[PDB]
Design an enzyme around this catalytic site. Structure first.
Site, PDB file in Angstrom:
ATOM      1  N   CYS A 112       0.892  -1.205   0.081  1.00 47.29           N
ATOM      2  CA  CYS A 112      -0.158   0.079   0.215  1.00 47.29           C
ATOM      3  C   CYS A 112       1.056   1.265   0.079  1.00 47.29           C
ATOM      4  CB  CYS A 112      -1.149  -0.064   1.108  1.00 47.29           C
ATOM      5  SG  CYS A 112      -0.261  -0.288   2.799  1.00 47.29           S
TER       6      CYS A 112
HETATM    7  O1  7XY Z   1      -2.160   0.845   5.251  1.00 45.66           O
HETATM    8  C1  7XY Z   1      -0.977   1.376   5.605  1.00 45.66           C
HETATM    9  O2  7XY Z   1      -0.193   0.708   5.827  1.00 45.66           O
HETATM   10  C2  7XY Z   1      -1.034   2.797   5.311  1.00 45.66           C
HETATM   11  O3  7XY Z   1      -0.542   3.169   4.389  1.00 45.66           O
HETATM   12  N1  7XY Z   1      -1.687   3.835   5.965  1.00 45.66           N
HETATM   13  C3  7XY Z   1      -1.344   5.282   5.684  1.00 45.66           C
HETATM   14  C4  7XY Z   1      -0.941   6.370   6.663  1.00 45.66           C
HETATM   15  C5  7XY Z   1       0.234   5.941   7.035  1.00 45.66           C
HETATM   16  C6  7XY Z   1       1.051   6.625   8.065  1.00 45.66           C
HETATM   17  C7  7XY Z   1       0.140   7.751   8.960  1.00 45.66           C
HETATM   18  C8  7XY Z   1      -1.353   7.990   8.646  1.00 45.66           C
HETATM   19 CL1  7XY Z   1      -2.495   8.756   9.440  1.00 45.66          CL
HETATM   20  C9  7XY Z   1      -1.733   7.149   7.343  1.00 45.66           C
HETATM   21  C10 7XY Z   1      -2.333   3.332   7.256  1.00 45.66           C
HETATM   22  C11 7XY Z   1      -3.860   3.750   7.043  1.00 45.66           C
HETATM   23  C12 7XY Z   1      -4.699   4.482   7.873  1.00 45.66           C
HETATM   24  C13 7XY Z   1      -5.950   4.273   7.190  1.00 45.66           C
HETATM   25  C14 7XY Z   1      -6.109   3.437   6.412  1.00 45.66           C
HETATM   26  S1  7XY Z   1      -7.696   3.242   5.394  1.00 45.66           S
HETATM   27  O4  7XY Z   1      -7.454   1.831   4.754  1.00 45.66           O
HETATM   28  O5  7XY Z   1      -8.948   2.744   6.668  1.00 45.66           O
HETATM   29  N2  7XY Z   1      -8.126   4.426   4.730  1.00 45.66           N
HETATM   30  C15 7XY Z   1      -7.029   4.620   3.663  1.00 45.66           C
HETATM   31  C16 7XY Z   1      -7.474   5.830   2.535  1.00 45.66           C
HETATM   32  C17 7XY Z   1      -7.451   7.163   2.994  1.00 45.66           C
HETATM   33  C18 7XY Z   1      -5.639   7.447   3.454  1.00 45.66           C
HETATM   34  C19 7XY Z   1      -4.830   7.374   2.497  1.00 45.66           C
HETATM   35  C20 7XY Z   1      -3.563   7.642   3.028  1.00 45.66           C
HETATM   36  C21 7XY Z   1      -3.126   8.204   4.373  1.00 45.66           C
HETATM   37  C22 7XY Z   1      -4.292   8.311   4.901  1.00 45.66           C
HETATM   38  C23 7XY Z   1      -5.655   7.925   4.779  1.00 45.66           C
HETATM   39  C24 7XY Z   1      -7.893   8.163   2.101  1.00 45.66           C
HETATM   40  C25 7XY Z   1      -8.007   8.038   0.944  1.00 45.66           C
HETATM   41  C26 7XY Z   1      -8.612   8.920   0.042  1.00 45.66           C
HETATM   42  C27 7XY Z   1      -9.138  10.177   0.458  1.00 45.66           C
HETATM   43  C28 7XY Z   1      -8.927  10.459   1.978  1.00 45.66           C
HETATM   44  C29 7XY Z   1      -8.384   9.264   2.917  1.00 45.66           C
HETATM   45  S2  7XY Z   1      -4.617   2.880   5.798  1.00 45.66           S
END
Ligand code: 7XY
Ligand code: 7XY
Length: 265
Positions: free
Chosen positions: A149
């Site tokens: 991802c």
């Molecule tokens: O899966 C991972 O490993 C990953 O890459 N992340 C992203 C991330 C990494 C570090 C810190 C944060 Cl806050 C998020 C952790 C995740 C947090 C939330 C998710 S989720 O699958 O429930 N929603 C993902 C889509 C979302 C998003 C993308 C990138 C970062 C944060 C949230 C999103 C897509 C489109 C519009 C808004 C949000 S996955």
């Protein structure tokens, strides 16, 4: 074992020793994969990549820089529809994480809430089952697959853990591989910090840079057994078993049993 230009990379068989080496791999985004990283994918015999990022992520950070002969399966999770109502819940949850206040305890309490509540929704979210369906089908067919991802820790963690449970591995082994993602926290932090430095004007909005880094540098970068258990409880409550969940995702026990034949030593 590194994958140059990417991080949080491992052959799942590195900890799950019941697995044959060279079948199922996991990593971060491959947006910045360099020459050495591409040579590694080829050397390892990886033929298929499962790119779990939302289409929005792919658009803003770019496609995987994979070498020739590798098919990238785009397997967006969440799979979002021309529909602001579809993306709203995800945007609203991220905004709440960011803007809930200054203490580390409050910041990390918000991270725990965000992560937990998102994992609870993983099984039922548009795109997760299609991702799992494709990955299982590819694996059962004998193809070496790299699943990723952005961070390769949560979305990737969920897909990998379900594959491992499906082939009959025990909880402690699955959780050990899942938690290995914590060894990449400092690297994840740096990647995100560099992203903040480019999306924001560090000269004209340094307060926003500082505020944002403070919510994207600590508790929120790790994984915890409780996150995965929350997704797994959703599966239990709604589907009655992992098999029930896989069947709803369009995967039969026969395909699972074939995948087990392929993946196990
Ligand atoms: O899966 C991972 O490993 C990953 O890459 N992340 C992203 C991330 C990494 C570090 C810190 C944060 Cl806050 C998020 C952790 C995740 C947090 C939330 C998710 S989720 O699958 O429930 N929603 C993902 C889509 C979302 C998003 C993308 C990138 C970062 C944060 C949230 C999103 C897509 C489109 C519009 C808004 C949000 S996955
Ligand atoms: O920009 C991308 O690259 C991307 O598609 N992202 C951002 C992202 C990717 C991986 C990890 C993280 Cl933490 C965020 C996925 C998203 C997560 C959340 C969203 S959002 O619909 O809630 N829009 C707010 C993004 C936010 C932000 C982007 C990058 C880093 C930190 C914060 C933001 C952008 C601009 C002004 C204010 C906030 S979009």
């Amino acid at each position: 074992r590194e994958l140059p230009g990417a991080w949080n990379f491992r052959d799942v068989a590195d900890t799950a020793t019941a697995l044959r080496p060279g079948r199922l791999f996991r990593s971060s985004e491959l947006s910045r994969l360099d020459d050495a990283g591409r040579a590694t994918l080829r050397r390892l015999g990886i033929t298929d990549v499962a790119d779990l990022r939302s289409s929005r992520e792919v658009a803003r950070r770019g496609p995987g820089r994979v070498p020739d002969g590798i098919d990238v399966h785009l397997l967006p999770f969440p799979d979002l529809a021309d529909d602001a109502d579809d993306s709203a819940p995800h945007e609203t949850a991220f905004k709440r994480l960011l803007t809930n206040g200054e203490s580390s305890q409050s910041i990390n309490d918000a991270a725990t809430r965000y992560m937990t509540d998102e994992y609870r929704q993983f099984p039922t979210r548009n795109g997760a089952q299609r991702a799992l369906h494709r990955v299982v089908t590819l694996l059962a067919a004998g193809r070496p697959v790299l699943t990723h991802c952005f961070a390769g820790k949560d979305r990737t963690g969920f897909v990998v853990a379900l594959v491992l449970e499906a082939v009959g591995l025990d909880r402690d082994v699955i959780v050990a591989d899942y938690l290995r993602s914590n060894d990449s926290v400092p690297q994840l932090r740096a990647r995100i910090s560099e992203m903040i430095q480019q999306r924001f004007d560090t000269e004209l909005a340094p307060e926003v840079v500082t505020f944002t880094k403070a919510r994207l540098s600590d508790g929120v970068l790790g994984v915890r057994a409780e996150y995965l258990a929350a997704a797994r409880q959703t599966i239990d409550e709604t589907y009655g078993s992992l098999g029930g969940y896989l069947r709803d995702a369009g995967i039969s026990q026969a395909t699972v049993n074939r995948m087990r034949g392929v993946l196990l030593g």
